Amino acid sequence: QRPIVYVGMSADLIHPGHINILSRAAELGDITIGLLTDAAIASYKRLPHMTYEQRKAVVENLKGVASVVPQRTLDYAENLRTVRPDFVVHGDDWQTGVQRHTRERVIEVLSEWGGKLVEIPYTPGI
Amino acid sequence: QRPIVYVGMSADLIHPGHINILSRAAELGDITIGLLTDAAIASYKRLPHMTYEQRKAVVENLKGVASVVPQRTLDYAENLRTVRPDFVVHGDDWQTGVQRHTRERVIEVLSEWGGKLVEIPYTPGI
């Protein structure tokens, strides 16, 4: 099969930054969205306005998205070990600040099966 | 070809109500979104936070959407005469209130080539 591309998202309100990520991810293979739960999101930022099921109804309908799975924690390891993607895609915002430790763990965990992180310039102004 | 289904949207922030409309519309054929411009939207409600190009980047990436065209006015006639869709889909909110006259004109204009309006229960609570 095609490679598996894992994309973590809160995705409270979809905007062109998200679309950019998904468009870049689709270049790498079939996208599985790791849709973060309330509890995951609450652990590092403000809770979203929309519920998990509401956010899922939107994101599952974005072009390029093959599957959507819950990501119950900010940390990606448990999901990465289950789905074993070839790629993870994220914006470069998480090189600094609250998600940096989670980013480092994505790189180290993916190395276990030779997966790669691909980072995209964050879309400014939105 | 498949039937052409016209769906008017401001689509400032996509939520499951919109997804429902698009999912119902896709049952009828290939979706063309009439994406309303600022000037169109300003004529009957508050201006959106996102620009036309920002809203288009999102909506063009929704599953089932074949084409996106600007709709420069609240009134649908000019676009309907150009695209000549078999169907128009809208929520039933516009049976009452500010869009009711536009709704009536959709029905009458579509009759010119035997197109039909299909209305969907508005998604409450969002």
Ligand SMILES: Nc1ccn([C@@H]2O[C@H](COP(=O)(O)OP(=O)(O)CCO)[C@@H](O)[C@H]2O)c(=O)n1
């Ligand atoms: N203006 C923006 C806003 C978001 N993004 C990227 O979208 C992706 C999804 O963002 P979000 O839903 O905020 O998810 P995260 O909180 O980063 C999920 C956990 O890593 C992410 O890769 C982010 O860098 C982006 O590239 N540009």
Ligand SMILES: Nc1ccn([C@@H]2O[C@H](COP(=O)(O)OP(=O)(O)CCO)[C@@H](O)[C@H]2O)c(=O)n1
């Ligand atoms: N909770 C909601 C919100 C919107 N909708 C439907 O989505 C469609 C798009 O809504 P919007 O982007 O607000 O477009 P309109 O301002 O109605 C476009 C001009 O008719 C429309 O058919 C509306 O009835 C819906 O069915 N349920």
